[PDB]
Amino acid sequence: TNINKSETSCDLNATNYIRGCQSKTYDGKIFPGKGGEKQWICKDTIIHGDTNGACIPPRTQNLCVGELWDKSYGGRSNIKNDTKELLKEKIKNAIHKETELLYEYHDTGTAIISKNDKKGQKGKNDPNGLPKGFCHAVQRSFIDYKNMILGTSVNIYEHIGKLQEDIKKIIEKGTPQQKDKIGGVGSSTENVNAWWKGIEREMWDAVRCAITKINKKNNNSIFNGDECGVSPPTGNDEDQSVSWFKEWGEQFCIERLRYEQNIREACTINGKNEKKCINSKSGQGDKIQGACKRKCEKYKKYISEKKQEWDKQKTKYENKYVGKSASDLLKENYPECISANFDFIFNDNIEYKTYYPYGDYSSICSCEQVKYYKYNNAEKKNNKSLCYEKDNDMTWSKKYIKKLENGRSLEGVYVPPRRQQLCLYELFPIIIKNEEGMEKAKEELLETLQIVAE
């Protein structure tokens, strides 16, 4: 293991007049009131090249570049008179205007990660004093700033290529070595970023200084220098196409749980056993008269747009990391995804769209009394959500084998193709529904089990 470093230096409580911003407003504006939300701009954005990479996080859209790139000169080539170490303390203070916006944005609920189910943001708190989201600032915000320093194909919002060509010109102007350059473009990103990654051995010393003055200068959490551990994070994930994918997944799952709570408040609360509403009747079956509609049609729209974002985030992630799945990447990195089935909620199937208008919450949004109908007398068999034709050519696979609470693994059993495509889609929405009001769960479970088996 390594150690921490000096100093108590950087007493720049008022660093300088930073022209960038005092508040990172990508999830609306600070309370009072909201508005000013930045969004995950989709693929094929010209300002980010061909945008072959993943979509653009809103926080990275309003990333606090501070005074490395800045404005008041239209789009200023800001590093020609300004510096880079103001960003050292505006990683510190841009995450002090954002650890006072941790403390307000993240720790009062004007961020997405900010708000949990109902208790809020202080009942949930990691060991390092911080409401959840600063562990995702050293990881999200800090790594994204280091990414801005390095940059993938998706150039961020000010043609970061101009700043990188400046790094070639205006930062390779005798930094770090003399004008006798070392290496070239290969070993540019690791000479002016190996005495900026070799002093991100010291910018990680400087970001552990950042956290230790998040402890000693603005004291929302007081301990030694340890942001997420005294070491920089693992490689192969700091890739913007991966870290941004993880950010997108966490944000999506948090706000999906949010909409789940809202539809609880409209179909668990304000709702009934069939999740209907005031005078829901036929009519068009027992469809919602509206009380759920405007509380769940918003969920349908949200899933539509987030699917439009995820469909081709996932494709890029897979083809870049062939052999790993997007759900695999997301689910264990954020414990709030454990109830999310990105396959089910994002099925590319018109029958799925029709039969599950409200995604995995269809059974807890619009209920027509799920009921297995026997062999005769107006069989309702195809009239429910359906099943693929069985694929003949699948290969025996050892993925998704359970892991024993022994901690062991089965290590040798292979799932038959007949079983790994066993069709149990119907069962999932019912399972999601029957979290509540038990002893009806079994009643609906037997019916949906019959229809699945049939």
Partner: antibody, heavy 122, light 107 residues
């Protein structure tokens, strides 16, 4: 042949704490494990016991529901998660192994660890 | 399940025979082990199966059983045998230890 515990700490009353126990040349895969606590200047007291495959977990009547035991054989560790700690649970906690590989949680504790103090106070 | 161990403070002198009793309320037929603990150390298992002396233990120890009365006998008490003895039963559920008998030198 070598058991060491981690997690001994001073915790607020009603808090939580996770003790861990390693294993040495010991083949920590088919031996049951147990946790035994000794309050300062008192007699030993069995606390928890876990089977070889962790399909059988037994707890002392006093520490029940408040205590959870678990294994992780590839990591070769056994953990005790403790919650709602009272002022009376202040004790030196030992992790011990059966001296006989078997299919039961409880057995004769042949090898013991050095133990960790779990002083509980405000 | 309780394990009543008595006496609690048995005294003796070097060369004496020392007997410790560990009455068990229920039937454990022979799933009982004896533990010796000197001050400030980990316990050491002396006897298991209520009679089977563990290897390396001095042969002056012995353990016998009558129904649910288990007795540990030190034939020739030695100055390095002054400790507490615990008689933990391990048949099934609570595997509870005994109260603990503390030997002392009689002067």
């Amino acid at each position: 042949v070598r058991l060491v515990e981690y997690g001994g700490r001073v915790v607020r009353p009603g808090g939580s704490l996770r003790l861990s126990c390693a294993a040495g040349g010991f083949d920590f895969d088919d031996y049951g494990m147990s946790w035994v606590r000794q309050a300062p200047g008192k007699g030993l007291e069995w606390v928890a016991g876990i089977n070889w495959n962790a399909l059988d977990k037994k707890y002392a009547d006093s520490v029940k529901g408040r205590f959870t035991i678990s294994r992780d054989n590839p990591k070769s560790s056994v953990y005790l998660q403790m919650t709602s700690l009272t002022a009376e649970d202040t004790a030196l906690y030992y992790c011990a192994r059966d001296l006989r590989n078997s299919i039961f949680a409880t057995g004769a504790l042949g090898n013991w660890g050095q133990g960790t103090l779990v002083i509980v106070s405000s | 399940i309780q394990m009543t161990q008595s006496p609690s403070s048995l005294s003796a002198s070097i060369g004496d025979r020392v007997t410790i009793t560990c009455r068990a309320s229920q039937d454990i037929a022979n799933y009982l082990a004896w533990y010796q603990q000197k001050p400030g150390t980990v316990p050491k298992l002396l006897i298991y199966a209520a009679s089977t002396l563990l290897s390396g233990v001095p042969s002056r120890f012995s353990g016998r059983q009558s129904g649910t009365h288990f007795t540990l006998t030190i034939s020739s008490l030695q100055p390095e045998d002054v400790a507490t003895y615990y008689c933990q039963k391990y048949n099934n559920a609570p595997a509870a230890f005994g109260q603990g008998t503390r030997l002392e030198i009689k002067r």
